[PDB]
């Protein structure tokens, strides 16, 4: 396929808890000084998410290919804009209409085309010694691009392309969604200043833009870059320096939250309905502080542990070839009568011996007939 | 135009940022089937659509009536999935002059059946096989399993139900975002502090236009008050926000 990469010390992962993230503006309805709730793909409070290590200074460059579950929340605690790419696709063999989002050194390129892919595509920048120059040297993303469907190129701008190491100074919050095929992006830059796993606090989420794609997304990938300098042995397949990065990924669930808005109509307080018994009580009466008392809730429900089928031992087959075009049938005034019982009947088997013209089952849909016992 | 794709590899086209019309559809070719599900054809130019997607293919007349949002069938279950809440239009028209050869059409192919079920807006790129019950065969031209792709037999000597109908479905949404695909009605001057009728991208009504007092993100179109009616509107051209009373 393509080149491989080595010296990867793949260490066991660590589960870390979250604090009050994943609350955005759901739709167009501007709401000021009024509480509201909706049933949509959201993020629960206090969830045990998985964090992948990316510090090289060590020797870790991990980007697993996770299937695209409905709803994705992303939170990157960056310091030098390490994450630049995302890929969407199912087969990655220049036949699937794959989508590449890249924060290129000049533009922000969003390309929906037939790219042929390798095992672990990535990006790499080489740092010269005589001059402090940063420029995109290795672009190991796709092998061929024959069929295309969408192209967007952002404005030509320049970034610093830092290669520094230290503490996390920026937080990028993204939402990856799939509604009717669309791809809504909710981007938020946050001036954070810590060294390690996500801190507490909460703020509203600002949607960025809805990419009007309509292609299937079943698998996805978040991409990374690398640094090349004198510290490397002198090659790219084994010599590589990543840096230090941290990102969090969370699958979204069909949740519901009550939202608080001020006179300026801004998301300030959000509360759940199904996180503890108190949450439903708070969002039932459409307030935050409720007076001392007791209030009606839902009732306990039991999910069926099994779903069994109980039919009698019947093996006989209903003869329908004799019913449909066997040798000869009678007239209408002396209408031909046939009795059928004690056998299995089907409707999908009616489209083999002869193609029919009119087929109308009065009151009964043709799809359910095998599910009832006549 | 010149040639369209098959149904299993359905042709996708993206249309936006232009004016659309329905009365202009009756000039280049006279159509046969034209059914806009849920939407009357007379009102389409009066609404302002977003993200037009055209799915184009060619099928036999024996399955044209089957393509509809919510039924079953050979093609409706295993080749494409029309959503039940979906709002759009479907147009089918016969094409004998280009999709009907004297020796028959063999270039195009069609998949009668598929292994698993479908999801909305899905294209399959696998030649995997249909094989009786469970435990697949994987298929290499032998009997009592089923390779998915067969070829058509369209000749001018075939029947009416055996005619090649080009089918194109137009898909869109409404009342969800600032649109740009709306039509040939011309705008006029903007009047403030008066009880007048108004129109913004197909959204009509009567009220008073006043000045707003809040910062809004530059991708919001309409705000709804506690009564769920529109009380804030963004100007289509000056991009100023006006309150409705």
């Amino acid at each position: 396929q393509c080149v491989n990469l080595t010296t990867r010390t793949q260490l066991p992962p660590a589960y870390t808890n979250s604090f009050t993230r994943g609350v955005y503006y759901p739709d167009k309805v501007f709401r000021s000084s009024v509480l509201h709730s909706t049933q949509d793909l959201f993020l629960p409070f206090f969830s045990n998410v998985t964090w992948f290590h990316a510090i090289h200074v060590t020797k870790r460059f991990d980007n697993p290919v996770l299937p695209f579950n409905d709803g994705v929340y992303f939170a990157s605690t960056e310091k030098s804009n390490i994450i630049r790419g995302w890929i969407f696709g199912t087969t990655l063999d220049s036949k699937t209409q794959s989508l590449l989002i890249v924060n290129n050194a000049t533009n922000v390129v969003i390309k929906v085309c037939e790219f042929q892919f390798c095992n672990d595509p990535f990006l790499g920048v080489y740092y010269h010694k005589n001059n402090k120059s940063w420029m995109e040297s290795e672009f190991r993303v796709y092998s061929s691009a024959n069929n295309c469907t969408f192209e967007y190129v952002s404005q030509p701008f320049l970034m610093d392309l830092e290669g520094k190491q230290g503490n996390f100074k920026n937080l990028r919050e993204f939402v990856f969604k799939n509604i009717d095929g669309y791809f809504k992006i909710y981007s938020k830059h946050t001036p954070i200043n810590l060294v390690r796993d996500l801190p507490q606090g909460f703020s509203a989420l600002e949607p960025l833009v809805d990419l009007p794609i309509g292609i299937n997304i079943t698998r996805f990938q978040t991409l990374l870059a690398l640094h090349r300098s004198y510290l490397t042995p002198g090659d790219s397949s084994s010599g590589w320096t990543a840096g230090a990065a941290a990102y969090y990924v969370g699958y979204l669930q069909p949740r519901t939250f009550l939202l608080k808005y001020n006179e300026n109509g801004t998301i300030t307080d959000a509360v759940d309905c199904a996180l503890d018994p108190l949450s439903e009580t708070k969002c039932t009466l459409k307030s935050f502080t409720v007076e001392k008392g007791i209030y009606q809730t839902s009732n306990f429900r039991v999910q069926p542990t099994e779903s069994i089928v109980r039919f009698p031992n019947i093996t006989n087959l209903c003869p329908f070839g004799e019913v449909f075009n066997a040798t000869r049938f009678a007239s209408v005034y002396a209408w031909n009568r046939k009795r059928i019982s004690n056998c299995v009947a089907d409707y999908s088997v009616l489209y083999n011996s002869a193609s029919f013209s009119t087929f109308k089952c009065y009151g009964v849909s043709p799809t359910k007939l095998n599910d009832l016992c006549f | 135009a010149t040639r369209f794709a098959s149904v299993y590899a359905w042709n996708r086209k993206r249309i936006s940022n232009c004016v659309a019309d329905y009365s202009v559809l009756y000039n280049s070719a006279s159509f046969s089937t034209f059914k806009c599900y849920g939407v009357s054809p007379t009102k389409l130019n009066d609404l302002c659509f977003t993200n037009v997607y055209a799915d184009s293919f060619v099928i036999r007349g024996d399955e044209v009536r089957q393509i509809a949002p919510g039924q079953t069938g050979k093609i409706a279950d295993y080749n494409y999935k029309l959503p039940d809440d979906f709002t759009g239009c479907v147009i089918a028209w016969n094409s004998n002059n280009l999709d009907s050869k004297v020796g028959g059409n063999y270039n195009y192919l069609y998949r009668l059946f598929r292994k698993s079920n479908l999801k909305p807006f899905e294209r399959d790129i696998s030649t995997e096989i249909y094989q009786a019950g469970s435990t697949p065969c994987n298929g290499v031209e032998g009997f009592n399993c089923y390779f998915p792709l067969q070829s058509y037999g369209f000749q001018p000597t075939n029947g009416v139900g055996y005619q090649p109908y080009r089918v194109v479905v137009l898909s869109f949404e409404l009342l969800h975002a600032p649109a740009t695909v709306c039509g040939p009605k011309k705008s006029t001057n903007l009047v403030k502090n008066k009880c007048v009728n108004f129109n913004f991208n197909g959204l009509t009504g009567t009220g008073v236009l006043t000045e707003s007092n809040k910062k809004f993100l530059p991708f919001q179109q309409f705000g709804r008050d506690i009564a769920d009616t529109t009380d804030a509107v963004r100007d289509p051209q000056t991009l100023e926000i006006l309150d409705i009373t």
Partner: antibody
Amino acid sequence: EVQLVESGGGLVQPGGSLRLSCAASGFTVSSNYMSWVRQAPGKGLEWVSAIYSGDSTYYADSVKGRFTISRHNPKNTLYLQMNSLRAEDTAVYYCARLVGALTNIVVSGDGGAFDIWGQGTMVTVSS
Amino acid sequence: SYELTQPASVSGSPGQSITISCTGTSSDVGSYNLVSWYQQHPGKAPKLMIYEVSKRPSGVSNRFSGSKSGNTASLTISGLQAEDEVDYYCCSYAGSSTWVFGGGTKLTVLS
């Protein structure tokens, strides 16, 4: 050593019964294969005898109430108490093998490979 | 009493390829797979040459093959020799672990 041997052949008259047998040698019938293919020279064939032990609902809708058969695993031999033998059953049967999916022969695949047979017996139901 | 359609008389020149079929119905088109082809010198128990239609028998010359699509068949017997004038059958499913197969294609080698 490993061989399927048919035994228990005798004369059958209308109204009588007889106990046939297919004995495996080398491999025990407790965890092995037995497929009873019924052959009439010159025409098509049919696999009929539906005895996979455990005694649940698995039968063919052609010999209902006619072919009764028992299981004996440790003795490495199966007996066929073919009751109500019809005079139109003039055919020499063969107990044979198959292939499934479990062991090293199939890790990915389907199976179904009859590969080891018997020699058959000569039993005639004549009035 | 249960019997399915096969082409009884088939013949082919040595070194050529011949196609063998056995008939089923629409209740056998969705997604099953069970077809194993036979071989009989007349008058004795059969011989296994092809099973698991497009995969590998343990010890068998790889000149024989099978191919699978729709109502369009092949047991592809290629590289015919003088010892191929033998009887042939298939196998097939009948639903709920039941079984049925075809009516004995008989091959005659010419030349």
